[PDB]
């Protein structure tokens, strides 16, 4: 009837990651799958109780409802320090359009508890836009928000196979906008694409093109909260750069430059990867590839005139670049990804991290 699970992984960005869950399909004969799941890594803990009916209608329209909690510690994610403890509830409806496309629309409630904020310009500029004026000389602060959102998504998946695709595309579009009554007033949109184009008949030589776009902004005079910022850098965005390093850096208050990433409300990542046959013994379990990764994160509300003695963090043209080699293998400890990359285009304060890996 039901099942339970526990998992352990390891990677350069997350450290040791733990996962645990209990699922009961058709709980009490209701037609709803009931799940209790949790994750934990070096910088974040997440937990949720979900209730899901994949056949809310006999045609496959699905209904999901959940209660969740998230604890994020930003210094553990190599950002300027803050603690963000959140909880809430989401209701979502999934709509199959055809074999390759599904849509989703939902409503969300989240309460955010911000604390341990080390005073910095971008963060304090967001707080001022919210009517909040905390002390710039101490980390003793608290900022709470309650947000109601309309959520939407589109998933396109026409890959030939899920593990080691050789042909087709995967497109994920997400969006959200606050509803009147929220403390915050903003929208945020994400677009991820992956396209595999095989070169030879046997699909052993494949070209992968990947893009990641993110844009959010405040509606009215309020800004998008810094705790919804996009980040770039690491194994999944621009290899050869430490996780979340790309983009704006904190400008602390005593006017104080730094190399602590803060993220931004705009992001663009692009990547060209050449999957080749694995050298040495042979073959369907190992994927060798050579890549060119690029990315930029920026702050569209960075006031360069007021801070002309600092780098212009509203500039999108500071494109970071790296080149390297990756190896993927389904190992007895789970999926394994190893990369060695060299940042051949970095900007001041960017942290390099040539060898990166993930297990699970």
């Amino acid at each position: 009837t039901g099942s339970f699970n526990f998992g352990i992984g390891y990677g350069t960005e997350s450290g040791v990651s733990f996962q645990a869950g209990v699922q009961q399909d058709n709980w009490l004969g209701t037609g709803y799958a009931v799940g209790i799941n949790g994750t934990k890594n070096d910088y974040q803990t997440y937990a949720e109780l979900s209730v899901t009916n994949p056949y809310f209608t006999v045609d496959g329209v699905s209904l999901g409802g959940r209660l969740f909690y998230n604890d994020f510690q930003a210094d553990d994610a190599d950002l300027s320090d803050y603690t963000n403890k959140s909880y809430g509830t989401d209701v979502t409806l999934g709509f199959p359009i055809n074999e390759y496309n599904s849509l989703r629309a939902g409503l969300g409630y989240v309460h955010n508890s911000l604390s341990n904020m080390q005073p910095q310009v971008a963060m304090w500029r967001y707080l001022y836009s919210m009517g909040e004026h905390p002390s710039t000389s101490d980390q003793d602060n608290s900022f709470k928000t309650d947000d109601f959102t309309f959520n939407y998504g589109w998933t396109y998946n026409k890959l030939d196979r899920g593990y080691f695709p050789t042909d087709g595309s995967r497109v994920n579009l997400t969006g959200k906008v606050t509803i009147p009554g929220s403390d915050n007033e903003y929208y945020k949109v994400t677009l991820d694409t992956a396209t595999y184009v095989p070169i030879d008949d046997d699909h052993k030589w494949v070209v992968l093109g990947r893009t990641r776009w993110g844009y959010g902004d405040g509606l009215g005079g309020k800004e998008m909260p810094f705790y919804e910022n996009f980040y770039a850098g690491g194994s999944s965005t621009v290899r050869g750069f430490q996780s979340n390093t790309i983009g704006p850096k904190a400008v602390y208050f005593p006017l104080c430059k730094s190399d602590d990433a803060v993220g931004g409300n705009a992001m663009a990542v692009a990547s060209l990867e050449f999957i080749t046959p694995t050298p040495f013994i042979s073959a369907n379990s190992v994927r060798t590839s050579f890549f060119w990764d690029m990315g930029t994160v920026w702050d569209t509300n960075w006031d360069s005139s007021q801070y002309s003695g600092y780098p212009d963090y509203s500039d999108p043209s500071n494109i970071r670049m790296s080149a390297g080699i990756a190896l993927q293998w389904m190992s007895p400890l789970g999926p394994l990804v190893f990369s060695y990359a060299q940042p051949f285009k970095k900007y001041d304060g960017d942290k390099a991290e040539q060898f990166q890996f993930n297990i699970g």
Partner: peptide, 7 residues
């Protein structure tokens, strides 16, 4: 790694 056991 992930271990999964039904009931």
């Amino acid at each position: 790694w992930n271990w999964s056991k039904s009931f």
